Protein backbone atom coordinates (compact mmCIF):
# COMPACT_ATOMS: atom_id res chain seq x y z
CA UNK A 1 0.00 0.00 0.00
CA UNK A 2 2.18 2.97 1.20
CA UNK A 3 5.81 4.07 0.75
CA UNK A 4 7.79 5.84 3.49
CA UNK A 5 10.75 8.02 2.52
CA UNK A 6 13.52 9.36 4.76
CA UNK A 7 14.77 12.62 3.26
CA UNK A 8 18.19 13.96 4.28
CA UNK A 9 17.89 17.69 5.00
CA UNK A 10 21.46 18.26 6.17
CA UNK A 11 23.39 18.42 9.44
CA UNK A 12 23.44 20.75 12.45
CA UNK A 13 26.04 21.20 15.20
CA UNK A 14 25.46 22.26 18.80
CA UNK A 15 26.80 21.92 22.35
CA UNK A 16 26.45 18.31 23.51
CA UNK A 17 24.96 19.67 26.74
CA UNK A 18 21.95 20.79 24.68
CA UNK A 19 21.57 17.15 23.61
CA UNK A 20 22.61 15.50 26.89
CA UNK A 21 22.26 17.85 29.87
CA UNK A 22 25.35 17.86 32.10
CA UNK A 23 27.07 15.22 29.97
CA UNK A 24 30.56 15.82 31.40
CA UNK A 25 30.47 17.75 34.73
CA UNK A 26 33.44 19.72 36.05
CA UNK A 27 35.42 18.10 38.88
CA UNK A 28 38.21 19.07 41.28
CA UNK A 29 40.59 17.51 38.74
CA UNK A 30 38.74 19.01 35.76
CA UNK A 31 37.42 22.39 37.05
CA UNK A 32 37.20 23.88 33.56
CA UNK A 33 35.69 20.81 31.89
CA UNK A 34 35.08 21.30 28.16
CA UNK A 35 32.02 20.42 26.09
CA UNK A 36 31.86 19.24 22.48
CA UNK A 37 30.25 20.74 19.37
CA UNK A 38 28.48 17.62 18.10
CA UNK A 39 26.91 17.11 14.67
CA UNK A 40 23.49 15.56 14.10
CA UNK A 41 21.11 14.92 11.15
CA UNK A 42 18.09 16.97 10.15
CA UNK A 43 15.54 14.80 8.36
CA UNK A 44 11.91 14.65 7.27
CA UNK A 45 9.65 11.69 6.48
CA UNK A 46 7.24 11.47 3.56
CA UNK A 47 4.47 8.91 3.80
CA UNK A 48 3.21 8.49 0.24
CA UNK A 49 -0.20 7.11 1.22
CA UNK A 50 -3.11 6.29 -1.16
CA UNK A 51 -5.36 8.46 1.04
CA UNK A 52 -2.88 11.31 0.51
CA UNK A 53 0.73 12.37 1.10
CA UNK A 54 1.67 12.99 4.74
CA UNK A 55 4.86 14.88 5.64
CA UNK A 56 6.43 14.64 9.10
CA UNK A 57 8.52 17.75 9.88
CA UNK A 58 9.90 20.22 7.32
CA UNK A 59 13.57 20.76 8.30
CA UNK A 60 15.16 24.23 8.07
CA UNK A 61 14.27 27.05 5.67
CA UNK A 62 16.73 27.51 2.75
CA UNK A 63 17.34 31.11 3.87
CA UNK A 64 18.17 30.17 7.46
CA UNK A 65 21.93 30.68 7.40
CA UNK A 66 24.32 33.44 6.31
CA UNK A 67 24.43 37.29 6.49
CA UNK A 68 20.98 37.65 4.88
CA UNK A 69 19.76 34.64 6.88
CA UNK A 70 16.41 34.58 8.70
CA UNK A 71 18.18 33.07 11.71
CA UNK A 72 19.73 35.57 14.12
CA UNK A 73 23.54 35.56 14.15
CA UNK A 74 23.71 34.17 17.70
CA UNK A 75 21.41 31.34 16.60
CA UNK A 76 23.51 30.65 13.49
CA UNK A 77 26.58 30.38 15.72
CA UNK A 78 25.12 28.09 18.39
CA UNK A 79 23.15 25.80 16.07
CA UNK A 80 24.79 26.06 12.59
CA UNK A 81 23.06 24.22 9.75
CA UNK A 82 25.12 22.81 6.88
CA UNK A 83 23.17 21.66 3.82
CA UNK A 84 23.75 21.32 0.08
CA UNK A 85 20.99 22.39 -2.31
CA UNK A 86 20.22 18.68 -2.72
CA UNK A 87 19.43 18.52 1.01
CA UNK A 88 16.72 21.21 0.77
CA UNK A 89 13.27 19.68 1.28
CA UNK A 90 11.80 21.16 -1.91
CA UNK A 91 14.56 19.48 -3.91
CA UNK A 92 14.36 16.20 -1.97
CA UNK A 93 10.65 16.19 -2.82
CA UNK A 94 11.24 17.18 -6.44
CA UNK A 95 13.57 14.19 -6.75
CA UNK A 96 10.54 12.10 -5.77
CA UNK A 97 8.35 13.93 -8.30
CA UNK A 98 6.43 15.43 -5.37
CA UNK A 99 5.30 19.05 -5.46
CA UNK A 100 4.47 20.95 -2.22
CA UNK A 101 0.88 21.16 -3.47
CA UNK A 102 0.64 17.36 -3.39
CA UNK A 103 0.95 17.25 0.41
CA UNK A 104 -2.42 16.71 2.10
CA UNK A 105 -1.07 16.77 5.67
CA UNK A 106 1.99 18.22 7.37
CA UNK A 107 2.66 17.00 10.92
CA UNK A 108 4.80 19.48 12.85
CA UNK A 109 6.43 17.54 15.71
CA UNK A 110 7.10 20.98 17.21
CA UNK A 111 7.85 24.44 15.83
CA UNK A 112 11.60 24.62 16.47
CA UNK A 113 13.73 26.15 13.70
CA UNK A 114 14.97 22.79 12.40
CA UNK A 115 11.54 21.14 12.12
CA UNK A 116 9.19 23.93 10.98
CA UNK A 117 11.58 25.69 8.59
CA UNK A 118 9.59 24.99 5.41
CA UNK A 119 5.99 24.84 6.66
CA UNK A 120 5.39 27.91 4.49
CA UNK A 121 5.66 25.84 1.29
CA UNK A 122 2.67 23.64 2.08
CA UNK A 123 -0.17 26.03 1.29
CA UNK A 124 -2.53 23.28 0.09
CA UNK A 125 -1.99 21.15 3.20
CA UNK A 126 -3.56 20.94 6.64
CA UNK A 127 -0.79 21.68 9.15
CA UNK A 128 -1.18 19.53 12.25
CA UNK A 129 0.46 21.02 15.32
CA UNK A 130 0.06 20.90 19.08
CA UNK A 131 -2.05 23.85 20.22
CA UNK A 132 0.34 24.72 23.06
CA UNK A 133 3.29 24.68 20.66
CA UNK A 134 1.38 26.89 18.22
CA UNK A 135 0.37 29.29 20.99
CA UNK A 136 3.91 29.43 22.36
CA UNK A 137 5.42 30.29 18.97
CA UNK A 138 2.74 32.88 18.21
CA UNK A 139 3.69 34.61 21.49
CA UNK A 140 7.36 34.59 20.48
CA UNK A 141 6.16 36.24 17.27
CA UNK A 142 3.86 38.80 18.89
CA UNK A 143 6.52 39.81 21.44
CA UNK A 144 8.90 40.29 18.50
CA UNK A 145 11.37 37.76 19.94
CA UNK A 146 14.19 37.51 17.39
CA UNK A 147 16.63 35.14 19.12
CA UNK A 148 15.87 31.57 20.20
CA UNK A 149 14.61 28.43 18.46
CA UNK A 150 11.41 30.00 17.12
CA UNK A 151 12.27 31.94 13.96
CA UNK A 152 10.24 35.14 13.67
CA UNK A 153 10.77 35.34 9.91
CA UNK A 154 9.54 31.74 9.58
CA UNK A 155 6.32 32.38 11.53
CA UNK A 156 5.82 35.60 9.58
CA UNK A 157 5.88 33.55 6.37
CA UNK A 158 3.41 31.00 7.76
CA UNK A 159 0.89 33.78 8.41
CA UNK A 160 1.58 35.62 5.15
CA UNK A 161 1.21 32.36 3.21
CA UNK A 162 -2.15 31.73 4.92
CA UNK A 163 -1.42 28.18 6.10
CA UNK A 164 -4.38 26.04 7.15
CA UNK A 165 -3.91 24.86 10.73
CA UNK A 166 -5.34 21.96 12.67
CA UNK A 167 -4.26 22.21 16.30
CA UNK A 168 -4.11 19.15 18.52
CA UNK A 169 -5.80 20.06 21.80
CA UNK A 170 -3.94 19.50 25.07
CA UNK A 171 -6.05 16.50 26.07
CA UNK A 172 -6.96 15.38 22.54
CA UNK A 173 -6.68 11.67 21.77
CA UNK A 174 -4.34 10.33 19.07
CA UNK A 175 -5.61 11.22 15.59
CA UNK A 176 -6.05 8.63 12.84
CA UNK A 177 -4.77 10.60 9.85
CA UNK A 178 -4.94 7.56 7.55
CA UNK A 179 -4.90 3.76 7.58
CA UNK A 180 -1.88 2.87 9.73
CA UNK A 181 -0.95 6.52 10.36
CA UNK A 182 -1.72 7.88 13.83
CA UNK A 183 -0.65 11.27 15.19
CA UNK A 184 0.58 10.78 18.77
CA UNK A 185 -0.02 13.65 21.22
CA UNK A 186 3.09 13.51 23.42
CA UNK A 187 2.29 16.93 24.89
CA UNK A 188 4.73 19.07 26.89
CA UNK A 189 8.37 18.00 27.26
CA UNK A 190 11.24 19.08 24.99
CA UNK A 191 8.93 21.89 23.87
CA UNK A 192 5.45 23.21 24.72
CA UNK A 193 3.65 20.64 22.57
CA UNK A 194 5.26 17.57 20.98
CA UNK A 195 3.56 15.46 18.29
CA UNK A 196 4.70 12.05 17.06
CA UNK A 197 3.65 9.54 14.38
CA UNK A 198 2.90 5.86 14.62
CA UNK A 199 3.10 4.31 11.16
CA UNK A 200 2.01 0.71 10.57
CA UNK A 201 3.66 -0.43 7.33
CA UNK A 202 2.54 -3.73 5.71
CA UNK A 203 6.10 -5.03 5.32
CA UNK A 204 8.36 -2.93 7.56
CA UNK A 205 5.89 -3.09 10.45
CA UNK A 206 5.46 -0.42 13.14
CA UNK A 207 7.48 2.80 13.29
CA UNK A 208 7.35 5.56 15.90
CA UNK A 209 8.61 8.94 14.73
CA UNK A 210 9.60 10.49 18.06
CA UNK A 211 11.30 13.63 16.73
CA UNK A 212 12.84 15.63 19.59
CA UNK A 213 10.82 13.71 22.18
CA UNK A 214 13.93 11.52 22.00
CA UNK A 215 17.07 13.10 20.54
CA UNK A 216 19.17 9.92 20.44
CA UNK A 217 19.65 6.34 21.64
CA UNK A 218 21.73 7.85 24.44
CA UNK A 219 18.69 9.93 25.40
CA UNK A 220 16.53 6.80 25.28
CA UNK A 221 18.71 4.52 27.40
CA UNK A 222 17.62 3.16 29.72
CA UNK A 223 18.28 5.02 31.80
CA UNK A 224 16.90 8.26 30.34
CA UNK A 225 19.48 11.02 29.86
CA UNK A 226 17.45 14.26 29.48
CA UNK A 227 18.45 17.18 27.19
CA UNK A 228 19.49 20.75 27.97
CA UNK A 229 16.76 22.02 25.63
CA UNK A 230 13.71 21.23 27.76
CA UNK A 231 10.52 23.03 28.81
CA UNK A 232 8.74 20.35 30.87
CA UNK A 233 11.26 17.98 32.46
CA UNK A 234 8.53 15.76 33.92
CA UNK A 235 6.48 15.70 30.71
CA UNK A 236 9.69 14.80 28.87
CA UNK A 237 10.48 11.84 31.13
CA UNK A 238 6.87 10.61 30.93
CA UNK A 239 6.88 10.96 27.14
CA UNK A 240 10.02 8.84 26.74
CA UNK A 241 8.59 6.09 28.95
CA UNK A 242 5.30 6.28 27.06
CA UNK A 243 7.17 5.84 23.78
CA UNK A 244 9.10 2.91 25.26
CA UNK A 245 5.83 1.25 26.32
CA UNK A 246 4.12 1.87 22.96
CA UNK A 247 7.13 0.40 21.15
CA UNK A 248 7.15 -2.81 23.20
CA UNK A 249 3.37 -3.28 22.92
CA UNK A 250 3.22 -2.54 19.18
CA UNK A 251 6.59 -4.15 18.42
CA UNK A 252 7.48 -0.87 16.70
CA UNK A 253 10.86 0.68 15.88
CA UNK A 254 11.60 4.06 17.46
CA UNK A 255 13.11 6.64 15.11
CA UNK A 256 14.91 9.30 17.13
CA UNK A 257 14.98 12.96 16.08
CA UNK A 258 18.71 13.51 15.71
CA UNK A 259 20.71 10.27 16.00
CA UNK A 260 23.62 10.17 13.53
CA UNK A 261 24.17 6.41 13.92
CA UNK A 262 20.52 5.47 13.37
CA UNK A 263 20.29 7.91 10.45
CA UNK A 264 23.36 6.39 8.78
CA UNK A 265 21.54 3.04 8.84
CA UNK A 266 18.30 4.50 7.41
CA UNK A 267 17.51 3.96 3.73
CA UNK A 268 17.20 7.52 2.42
CA UNK A 269 15.20 8.83 -0.53
CA UNK A 270 18.20 8.53 -2.86
CA UNK A 271 18.24 4.74 -2.34
CA UNK A 272 14.55 3.95 -1.76
CA UNK A 273 11.73 3.70 0.76
CA UNK A 274 9.97 1.55 3.36
CA UNK A 275 6.82 -0.45 2.55
CA UNK B 1 10.75 38.84 70.62
CA UNK B 2 12.85 36.49 68.36
CA UNK B 3 16.50 36.40 67.25
CA UNK B 4 17.48 34.97 63.85
CA UNK B 5 21.03 33.68 63.34
CA UNK B 6 22.82 32.93 60.07
CA UNK B 7 25.40 30.21 60.73
CA UNK B 8 28.27 29.71 58.27
CA UNK B 9 28.54 25.97 57.65
CA UNK B 10 31.26 26.09 55.00
CA UNK B 11 31.73 26.38 51.23
CA UNK B 12 31.13 24.02 48.31
CA UNK B 13 32.28 24.07 44.68
CA UNK B 14 30.55 22.66 41.59
CA UNK B 15 30.14 23.13 37.84
CA UNK B 16 28.45 26.48 37.16
CA UNK B 17 26.15 24.59 34.78
CA UNK B 18 24.61 22.95 37.86
CA UNK B 19 23.79 26.41 39.21
CA UNK B 20 22.90 28.01 35.87
CA UNK B 21 21.93 25.46 33.21
CA UNK B 22 23.72 26.11 29.90
CA UNK B 23 25.47 29.23 31.21
CA UNK B 24 28.06 29.44 28.43
CA UNK B 25 27.07 27.41 25.31
CA UNK B 26 29.64 26.25 22.76
CA UNK B 27 29.70 28.09 19.43
CA UNK B 28 31.24 27.62 15.98
CA UNK B 29 34.06 29.81 17.32
CA UNK B 30 34.20 28.21 20.78
CA UNK B 31 33.37 24.52 20.04
CA UNK B 32 34.98 23.26 23.25
CA UNK B 33 33.57 25.98 25.51
CA UNK B 34 34.74 25.57 29.11
CA UNK B 35 32.68 25.59 32.29
CA UNK B 36 33.87 27.05 35.59
CA UNK B 37 34.01 25.46 39.04
CA UNK B 38 32.35 28.01 41.33
CA UNK B 39 32.36 28.38 45.13
CA UNK B 40 29.13 28.92 47.07
CA UNK B 41 28.17 29.13 50.78
CA UNK B 42 26.44 26.46 52.84
CA UNK B 43 24.44 28.01 55.67
CA UNK B 44 21.71 27.29 58.20
CA UNK B 45 19.32 29.64 60.00
CA UNK B 46 18.41 29.43 63.68
CA UNK B 47 15.26 31.21 64.80
CA UNK B 48 15.54 31.48 68.59
CA UNK B 49 11.82 31.93 69.22
CA UNK B 50 10.10 32.12 72.65
CA UNK B 51 7.77 29.33 71.48
CA UNK B 52 10.85 27.22 70.75
CA UNK B 53 14.00 27.07 68.61
CA UNK B 54 13.42 26.53 64.88
CA UNK B 55 16.30 25.42 62.64
CA UNK B 56 16.16 25.84 58.85
CA UNK B 57 18.45 23.32 57.11
CA UNK B 58 21.35 21.42 58.70
CA UNK B 59 24.26 21.75 56.25
CA UNK B 60 26.56 18.77 55.56
CA UNK B 61 27.59 15.99 57.95
CA UNK B 62 31.07 16.41 59.53
CA UNK B 63 32.03 12.95 58.24
CA UNK B 64 30.97 13.71 54.67
CA UNK B 65 34.33 14.16 52.94
CA UNK B 66 37.65 12.29 52.78
CA UNK B 67 38.68 8.59 52.38
CA UNK B 68 36.40 7.43 55.24
CA UNK B 69 33.69 9.92 54.21
CA UNK B 70 29.98 9.11 53.89
CA UNK B 71 29.88 10.79 50.48
CA UNK B 72 30.83 8.60 47.52
CA UNK B 73 34.15 9.59 45.92
CA UNK B 74 32.49 10.80 42.70
CA UNK B 75 30.23 13.03 44.80
CA UNK B 76 33.16 14.40 46.82
CA UNK B 77 34.83 15.27 43.51
CA UNK B 78 31.91 16.99 41.79
CA UNK B 79 30.58 18.79 44.88
CA UNK B 80 33.57 19.19 47.29
CA UNK B 81 32.76 20.69 50.71
CA UNK B 82 35.40 22.77 52.50
CA UNK B 83 34.79 23.43 56.20
CA UNK B 84 36.84 24.15 59.31
CA UNK B 85 35.64 22.65 62.60
CA UNK B 86 34.12 26.01 63.53
CA UNK B 87 31.85 25.82 60.46
CA UNK B 88 30.28 22.55 61.67
CA UNK B 89 26.68 23.14 62.73
CA UNK B 90 27.13 21.46 66.12
CA UNK B 91 29.96 23.90 66.86
CA UNK B 92 28.14 26.92 65.40
CA UNK B 93 25.25 26.07 67.74
CA UNK B 94 27.55 25.46 70.72
CA UNK B 95 29.00 28.96 70.26
CA UNK B 96 25.43 30.19 70.73
CA UNK B 97 24.96 28.01 73.81
CA UNK B 98 22.43 25.96 71.84
CA UNK B 99 22.32 22.19 72.33
CA UNK B 100 20.83 19.93 69.61
CA UNK B 101 18.25 18.88 72.20
CA UNK B 102 17.06 22.50 72.43
CA UNK B 103 15.72 22.45 68.86
CA UNK B 104 11.95 21.94 68.78
CA UNK B 105 11.60 22.09 64.99
CA UNK B 106 13.93 21.38 62.09
CA UNK B 107 12.72 22.49 58.66
CA UNK B 108 14.42 20.54 55.87
CA UNK B 109 14.11 22.65 52.70
CA UNK B 110 14.93 19.41 50.88
CA UNK B 111 17.02 16.32 51.62
CA UNK B 112 20.06 17.05 49.45
CA UNK B 113 23.48 16.25 50.94
CA UNK B 114 24.25 19.88 51.81
CA UNK B 115 20.98 20.66 53.61
CA UNK B 116 20.07 17.44 55.46
CA UNK B 117 23.59 16.44 56.54
CA UNK B 118 23.06 16.83 60.29
CA UNK B 119 19.37 15.97 60.69
CA UNK B 120 20.53 13.01 62.80
CA UNK B 121 21.60 15.32 65.64
CA UNK B 122 18.08 16.59 66.29
CA UNK B 123 16.50 13.63 68.08
CA UNK B 124 14.26 15.79 70.28
CA UNK B 125 12.94 17.86 67.36
CA UNK B 126 10.06 17.52 64.93
CA UNK B 127 11.61 17.27 61.46
CA UNK B 128 9.40 19.03 58.95
CA UNK B 129 9.93 17.81 55.40
CA UNK B 130 7.98 17.65 52.15
CA UNK B 131 6.43 14.19 51.85
CA UNK B 132 7.48 13.83 48.21
CA UNK B 133 11.07 14.70 49.17
CA UNK B 134 10.99 12.20 52.04
CA UNK B 135 9.53 9.49 49.80
CA UNK B 136 12.07 10.19 47.05
CA UNK B 137 15.01 9.88 49.45
CA UNK B 138 13.65 6.77 51.15
CA UNK B 139 13.53 5.18 47.68
CA UNK B 140 17.16 6.17 47.01
CA UNK B 141 17.94 4.35 50.27
CA UNK B 142 15.86 1.22 49.63
CA UNK B 143 17.36 0.91 46.14
CA UNK B 144 20.79 1.22 47.78
CA UNK B 145 21.73 4.20 45.61
CA UNK B 146 25.21 5.15 46.85
CA UNK B 147 25.97 7.93 44.34
CA UNK B 148 23.95 11.14 43.95
CA UNK B 149 22.76 14.01 46.15
CA UNK B 150 20.96 11.73 48.61
CA UNK B 151 23.52 10.26 51.02
CA UNK B 152 22.62 6.68 51.96
CA UNK B 153 24.67 6.84 55.17
CA UNK B 154 22.99 10.12 56.12
CA UNK B 155 19.55 8.57 55.60
CA UNK B 156 20.69 5.43 57.43
CA UNK B 157 21.57 7.57 60.46
CA UNK B 158 18.18 9.34 60.39
CA UNK B 159 16.39 6.00 60.71
CA UNK B 160 18.81 4.65 63.32
CA UNK B 161 18.50 7.83 65.40
CA UNK B 162 14.71 7.43 65.28
CA UNK B 163 13.97 10.98 64.11
CA UNK B 164 10.40 12.23 64.55
CA UNK B 165 9.05 13.26 61.16
CA UNK B 166 6.26 15.60 60.19
CA UNK B 167 5.72 15.41 56.43
CA UNK B 168 4.16 18.28 54.52
CA UNK B 169 1.50 16.83 52.23
CA UNK B 170 1.58 17.66 48.52
CA UNK B 171 -1.48 19.92 48.63
CA UNK B 172 -1.02 21.03 52.25
CA UNK B 173 -1.35 24.73 53.04
CA UNK B 174 1.45 26.76 54.64
CA UNK B 175 2.06 25.78 58.27
CA UNK B 176 2.08 28.36 61.05
CA UNK B 177 5.00 26.94 63.04
CA UNK B 178 5.16 29.87 65.47
CA UNK B 179 4.24 33.56 65.68
CA UNK B 180 5.67 35.11 62.50
CA UNK B 181 7.17 31.81 61.29
CA UNK B 182 5.42 30.04 58.42
CA UNK B 183 6.59 26.96 56.51
CA UNK B 184 6.06 27.54 52.79
CA UNK B 185 5.12 24.48 50.71
CA UNK B 186 6.84 25.15 47.36
CA UNK B 187 6.41 21.56 46.15
CA UNK B 188 8.40 20.04 43.29
CA UNK B 189 11.04 22.02 41.41
CA UNK B 190 14.75 21.83 42.24
CA UNK B 191 13.99 18.56 44.04
CA UNK B 192 10.93 16.35 44.67
CA UNK B 193 9.54 18.63 47.39
CA UNK B 194 10.83 22.03 48.53
CA UNK B 195 9.99 23.90 51.73
CA UNK B 196 10.66 27.56 52.47
CA UNK B 197 10.22 29.74 55.56
CA UNK B 198 8.56 33.11 55.84
CA UNK B 199 9.81 34.86 58.97
CA UNK B 200 8.24 38.11 60.16
CA UNK B 201 10.74 39.79 62.50
CA UNK B 202 9.62 42.81 64.61
CA UNK B 203 12.61 44.93 63.59
CA UNK B 204 14.11 43.44 60.41
CA UNK B 205 10.69 42.75 58.88
CA UNK B 206 9.84 39.92 56.47
CA UNK B 207 12.35 37.30 55.30
CA UNK B 208 11.80 34.45 52.85
CA UNK B 209 14.24 31.57 53.15
CA UNK B 210 14.11 30.09 49.65
CA UNK B 211 16.95 27.57 49.96
CA UNK B 212 17.55 25.90 46.58
CA UNK B 213 14.22 27.10 45.18
CA UNK B 214 16.48 30.00 44.19
CA UNK B 215 20.23 29.36 44.04
CA UNK B 216 21.35 32.96 43.48
CA UNK B 217 20.34 36.47 42.40
CA UNK B 218 21.31 35.39 38.88
CA UNK B 219 18.76 32.58 39.15
CA UNK B 220 16.14 35.02 40.40
CA UNK B 221 16.60 37.61 37.65
CA UNK B 222 14.34 38.53 36.08
CA UNK B 223 14.48 36.77 33.83
CA UNK B 224 14.74 33.41 35.60
CA UNK B 225 17.85 31.37 34.79
CA UNK B 226 17.06 27.76 35.84
CA UNK B 227 19.62 25.28 37.27
CA UNK B 228 21.03 22.02 35.91
CA UNK B 229 20.01 20.30 39.16
CA UNK B 230 16.26 20.21 38.54
CA UNK B 231 13.47 17.62 38.79
CA UNK B 232 10.40 19.66 37.82
CA UNK B 233 11.31 22.53 35.48
CA UNK B 234 7.75 23.90 35.43
CA UNK B 235 7.30 23.68 39.21
CA UNK B 236 10.68 25.37 39.56
CA UNK B 237 9.65 28.30 37.37
CA UNK B 238 6.28 28.56 39.12
CA UNK B 239 7.97 28.53 42.53
CA UNK B 240 10.41 31.36 41.72
CA UNK B 241 7.56 33.60 40.54
CA UNK B 242 5.52 32.67 43.62
CA UNK B 243 8.44 33.79 45.78
CA UNK B 244 8.70 37.05 43.81
CA UNK B 245 4.99 37.71 44.42
CA UNK B 246 5.09 36.89 48.16
CA UNK B 247 8.17 39.11 48.54
CA UNK B 248 6.42 41.97 46.74
CA UNK B 249 3.14 41.65 48.66
CA UNK B 250 4.80 41.10 52.06
CA UNK B 251 7.65 43.55 51.42
CA UNK B 252 10.03 40.73 52.36
CA UNK B 253 13.69 40.07 51.62
CA UNK B 254 14.53 36.91 49.69
CA UNK B 255 17.46 34.90 51.03
CA UNK B 256 18.85 32.66 48.29
CA UNK B 257 20.25 29.20 49.03
CA UNK B 258 23.83 29.61 47.80
CA UNK B 259 24.56 33.21 46.76
CA UNK B 260 28.17 34.11 47.57
CA UNK B 261 27.56 37.87 47.33
CA UNK B 262 24.39 37.93 49.44
CA UNK B 263 26.00 35.73 52.11
CA UNK B 264 28.98 38.08 52.49
CA UNK B 265 26.53 40.86 53.35
CA UNK B 266 24.69 38.68 55.91
CA UNK B 267 25.43 39.23 59.59
CA UNK B 268 26.56 35.79 60.76
CA UNK B 269 26.39 34.16 64.18
CA UNK B 270 29.90 35.33 65.07
CA UNK B 271 28.79 38.97 64.79
CA UNK B 272 25.14 38.85 65.87
CA UNK B 273 21.55 38.22 64.78
CA UNK B 274 18.37 39.69 63.31
CA UNK B 275 15.46 40.87 65.48
CO1 LIG C 1 13.52 20.71 19.04
CO1 LIG D 1 19.64 21.23 46.54
FE1 LIG E 1 15.35 19.24 16.52
FE1 LIG F 1 21.96 23.19 48.11
Author numbering:
A (entry chain B), B (entry chain A): 9 to 283
Task: Give me lines lifted from the publication on this model.
MLLs degrade N-acyl-L-homoserine lactones (AHLs), molecules that are used in a microbial communication system called quorum sensing (QS) to coordinate a variety of behaviors, including virulence and biofilm formation. The binuclear center, common to all MLLs, is coordinated by five histidine residues and two aspartic acid residues.
Asp122 is also conserved and is involved in coordinating the metal cation. The alterations in GcL activity may still suggest that this residue is important, but the interpretation of this effect is complicated by the clear role of this residue in metal coordination. Curiously, in this variant, the activation free energy for the terminal hydroxide mechanism increases substantially, leaving the concerted mechanism as the only energetically plausible pathway with calculated activation free energies within 3 kcal mol–1 of the experimental data.
